[PDB]
């Protein structure tokens, strides 16, 4: 089954998921000088005040903090989007070293990690239907650099000991994802895909210009997680990122000059 190792990693995925070589794959390099300012792009509207987190899960490729998406409680609107997208989960991708870990790159620069806040278009009724549509998901991507701690991340870091291995979950209620956002909501946007199998081409990517800083101790704790299940040989969950894919017939738009 797919993963991030030498024998089942990103270079292999196309054999089970041929869309890996498709026309709108993610992530991509964001060439800041070639991105086009679009003065008609609207500000993002991030409405997370009524967010209801439920659970945190190690799924063997990352950890997901899951939300109640059975009502419009935490929604993303505006920006390049038409309509309303509901927050279902967030997760991260990260490296074995501080100089790698992000999926998107900026002028070929890699960040230590990348946060994905995953939302689905409510006109499609459920997440499973949404991923089958070209405008089904909106993923808000936020870069992490190592420096000062992010206080709003700490509750996530503190629970990781309880979900060390694949298939473990823990209650994770009353977490406020607003504490993970940078000051600015300036962004780049382009049409792309899920960055893990099934690699479906259903995502409007919205990548924030401003990274958040996290501490070395915070990201070290991410790196103590395991890809494996309990009782299986230990394989540290690190380098769970897909590299940049060809841009092909796409232009990245910027909300800012
Ligand atoms: C049963 O189905 C699942 O578990 C499932 C998981 N995903 C999923 C994914 F593959 C992905 F790459 C990204 S990303 N990294 O934000 O683009 C996501 F946000 C995802 F939600 N899609 N389907
Ligand atoms: Zn992701």
Residues 6+ apart with CB under 8 A from 18: none
Determination technique used: X-ray
DSSP for 78-128, please give it.
ETT--S-EEEEEEEEEE-SSTT---SSEETTBPPSEEEEEEEEEGGGSSHH
Residue 80 CA to chain centroid, in angstroms? 18
Question: Best of 195, 202, 241, 245 to mutate for ligand 1, by most ligand atoms within 8 A of CB?
Answer: 195
Residues 6+ apart with CB under 8 A from 161: none
Is the previous residue joined to 198 through a cis bond, with omega within 30 degrees of 0? yes
Query: From the CA of 107, how far away is ligand 1's center (Å)?
Result: 26
Helix or strand (DSSP H, E) at 219: helix 216-222
**Residue ranges covered by each domain of the chain:** 1-257
DSSP annotation of 249 reads S
Output 152-158 pairs: Cβ under 8 A, ≥24 positions apart.
152/176, 152/178, 152/179, 152/180, 153/179, 153/180, 153/212, 153/214, 153/218, 154/218, 156/56, 156/65, 157/218, 157/221, 157/222
Residues 6+ apart with CB under 8 A from 207: 30, 104, 140, 141, 142, 143, 187, 188, 189
- CATH code reported for the domain at 1-257: 3.10.200.10
The residue behind tokens 């946060």 is 115
| Resolution value (Å, 1 decimal) | 1.5
Among candidate residues 222, 228, 252, the one with its CA nearest the CA of residue 102: 222
CB atoms within 10 A of CB 182: 15
DSSP annotation of 124 reads G
């Amino acid at each position: 089954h797919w993963g991030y190792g030498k024998h089942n990693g990103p270079e292999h995925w196309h054999k089970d998921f041929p869309i890996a070589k498709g026309e709108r794959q993610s992530p991509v390099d964001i060439d800041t000088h070639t991105a086009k300012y679009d003065p008609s792009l609207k500000p993002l509207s991030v409405s997370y005040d009524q967010a209801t987190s439920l659970r945190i899960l190690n799924n063997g490729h990352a950890f997901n903090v899951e939300f109640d998406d059975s009502q419009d409680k935490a929604v993303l609107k505006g920006g390049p989007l038409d309509g309303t997208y509901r927050l279902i989960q967030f997760h991260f991708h990260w490296g074995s070293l501080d100089g790698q870990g992000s999926e998107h790159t900026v002028d070929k620069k890699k960040y230590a990690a990348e946060l994905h806040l995953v939302h689905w278009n409510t006109k499609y009724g459920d997440f499973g239907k949404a991923v089958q549509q070209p405008d089904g998901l909106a993923v808000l991507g936020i870069f992490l650099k190592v420096g000062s701690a992010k206080p709003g991340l700490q509750k996530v870091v503190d629970v990781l000991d309880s979900i060390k291995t694949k298939g473990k979950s823990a209650d994770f209620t009353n977490f406020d994802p607003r504490g993970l956002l940078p000051e600015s909501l300036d962004y780049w946007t382009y049409p792309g895909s899920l960055t893990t199998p099934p690699l479906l081409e259903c995502v409007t990517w919205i990548v924030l210009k401003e990274p958040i800083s996290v501490s070395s101790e915070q990201v070290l704790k991410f790196r103590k997680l395991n890809f494996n299940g309990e009782g299986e040989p230990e394989e540290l969950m690190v380098d769970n990122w897909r590299p940049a894919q060809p841009l092909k017939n796409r232009q990245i738009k910027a909300s800012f000059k």
